[PDB]
Amino acid sequence: GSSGSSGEDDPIPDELLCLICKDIMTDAVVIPCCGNSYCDECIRTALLESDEHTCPTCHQNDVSPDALSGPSSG
Ligand SMILES: [Zn+2]
Ligand SMILES: [Zn+2]
């Protein structure tokens, strides 16, 4: 050996991932209804998926989509 870089490391932890597609959340958004990490889109589509805007984590009714920590209109 005698080359270097002797040691295994752990990649981005789960805590830094969404509970939907498990993909880096370019724009972490925390929902008020309950509070969870979801991709700017993940949370966007979700609300759509269901008949109406009903948060997946906690059955909500019209969860303030703007409330999210996204000043870019979402
Ligand atoms: Zn996602
Ligand atoms: Zn919720």
UniProtKB/Swiss-Prot annotation:
Highly expressed in the placenta and testis. Expressed at lower levels in the brain, heart, kidney, liver and lung. Overexpressed in esophageal cancer. It is found in: Nucleus, Nucleolus; Chromosome; Cytoplasm, Cytoskeleton, Microtubule organizing center, Centrosome. Disulfide bonds: none annotated. Contains a N-terminus DWNN domain, a zinc-finger domain and a C4C4 zinc-binding RING finger domain. The ring finger may indeed be a U-box domain. E3 ubiquitin-protein ligase which promotes ubiquitination of YBX1, leading to its degradation by the proteasome. May play a role as a scaffold protein to promote the assembly of the p53/TP53-MDM2 complex, resulting in increase of MDM2-mediated ubiquitination and degradation of p53/TP53; may function as negative regulator of p53/TP53, leading to both apoptosis and cell growth. Regulates DNA-replication and the stability of chromosomal common fragile sites (CFSs) in a ZBTB38- and MCM10-dependent manner. (Microbial infection) [Isoform 1]: Restricts ebolavirus replication probably by impairing the vp30-NP interaction, and thus viral transcription. Interacts with p53/TP53 and RB1. Interacts also with MDM2 and YBX1. Interacts with NEK6. Interacts with ZBTB38. This is E3 ubiquitin-protein ligase RBBP6. The chain holds residues 249 to 309 of 1792 of the full protein.
